[PDB]
């Protein structure tokens, strides 16, 4: 039992980490009520996969974690327990027994630049797939099957990173749409966070 733990840092940070390298902020030892969320912005989605937001104010969580992404446009639908795709095979992944849920809202006003924003990178291709909840910051030139190459670039030898060009005119379907993904566990351990009562 203490003051409100700083959701204002996770949900109101000046900058968000790129999709290929997402940070975690462990939150513990606080009492938080899920009521200030509705006073943020019109949510594009607020779907919850484990509980309902209305009843979420009367539960105790063993531990919580908050992520920070920059998705592109209408491709947000693939952030779900099971759906696959480019960012769901070579980037952040979700388990088949997910708990917690996803809060997404339009961020065109904050994360956009004239002529596009190049600060966000995503990894298109890998040697293989990746299990849920891992990161891969290693950057090396990738060949194509047979011909060996290193450092140099040319036929079938190219950098494994590509930069977004968001622009302010792409409209719906090609917009940042920031998103934060929580994670809960139901009464498995002594509760670090709870709700007012």
């Amino acid at each position, epitope marked *: 039992i203490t003051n409100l733990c700083p959701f204002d840092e996770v949900f109101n940070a000046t900058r968000f980490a790129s999709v290929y390298a997402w940070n975690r902020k462990r939150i513990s030892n606080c009492v938080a009520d899920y009521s200030v969320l509705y006073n943020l912005a019109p949510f594009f989605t607020f779907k919850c996969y484990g509980v309902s937001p209305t009843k979420l104010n009367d539960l105790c969580f063993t531990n919580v974690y908050a992520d920070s992404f920059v998705i592109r446009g209408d491709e947000v639908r693939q952030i779900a327990p099971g759906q696959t795709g480019n960012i769901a095979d070579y980037n952040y992944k979700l388990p088949d027994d997910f708990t917690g849920c996803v809060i997404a809202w339009n961020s*065109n006003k*904050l994360d956009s630049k004239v002529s596009g924003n190049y600060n966000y990178l995503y990894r298109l291709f890998r040697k293989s797939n990746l299990k849920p909840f891992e990161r891969d910051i290693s950057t090396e030139i990738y060949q194509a099957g047979n011909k060996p190459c290193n450092g140099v670039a040319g036929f079938n030898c190219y950098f494994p990173l590509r930069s977004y060009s968001f622009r302010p005119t792409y409209g719906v379907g090609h917009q940042p749409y920031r998103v934060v993904v929580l994670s809960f566990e139901l009464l498995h351990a002594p509760a670090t966070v709870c709700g007012p009562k």
Partner: antibody, heavy 118, light 106 residues
């Protein structure tokens, strides 16, 4: 919330402009914000020139990027505009603005006008 | 760039409206259009943002709306001080990303 910029009112056409603009108090802890410069010759219409974000990103306009330069003080004291090869067709007044996405140009300044001294 | 009526006039009090328009191919648009007042010797200021919205500390007589490929602003209550230019701006997609258009004349 005050904006002000200073520059030489009389300029020899061969001289390169060096303009400074200072802002007194902004929400520096934000994203997708910055300061830009706009000019207006007598008559015709406005045209956008350039703007710089807080993250140091640099976004000159096409067809004029060769003759523009930007110096960032990085201490929030002011911002510097530099242009080369002054062209008498570009005689106009230059305005500072607090660029944003919601507000294209939120706040402006009184403006200073400069003309060639040939 | 953009096209706007060079000269607009009307009886004082009521019954006046100004609009902007442009090519749909160049301007993706869908958002982010604004109208600015100008005065001789005084700095411009914002009046409307996001097609039809009003910021704080502005008169209630000023508003507007857009339909199809025609953007417009609604003005009522003509006093002896509303004789100001109205510049309409947006984001384009070719060469210069910012177009200010021809403007108005009051």
């Amino acid at each position: 919330i005050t904006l002000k910029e200073s520059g030489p009112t009389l300029v020899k056409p061969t001289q390169t402009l060096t303009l400074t603009c200072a802002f007194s108090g902004f929400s520096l802890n934000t994203g997708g914000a910055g300061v830009g410069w706009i000019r207006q010759p007598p008559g015709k219409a406005l045209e956008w020139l350039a703007l710089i974000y807080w993250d140091g990103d640099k976004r000159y306009n096409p067809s004029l990027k060769s003759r523009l330069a930007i110096i960032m003080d990085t201490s929030k004291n002011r911002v510097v505009l530099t242009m080369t090869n002054m062209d008498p067709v570009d005689t106009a007044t230059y305005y500072c603005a607090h660029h944003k996405i919601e507000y294209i140009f939120d706040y402006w300044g009184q403006g200073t006008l400069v003309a060639v001294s040939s | 760039a953009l096209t706007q009526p060079a000269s607009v006039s009307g009886s004082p009090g009521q019954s006046i409206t100004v609009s902007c328009t442009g090519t749909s191919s160049d301007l993706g648009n869908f958002q982010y259009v604004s109208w600015y007042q100008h005065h001789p010797g005084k700095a411009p200021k914002l009046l409307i943002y996001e097609v039809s919205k009003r910021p704080s500390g502005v008169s209630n007589r000023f508003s507007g709306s857009k339909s199809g490929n025609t953007a417009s602003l609604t003005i009522s209550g003509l006093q002896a001080e509303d004789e100001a230019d109205y510049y309409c701006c947006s984001y384009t997609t070719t060469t210069i990303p910012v177009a200010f258009g021809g403007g108005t004349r009051l």
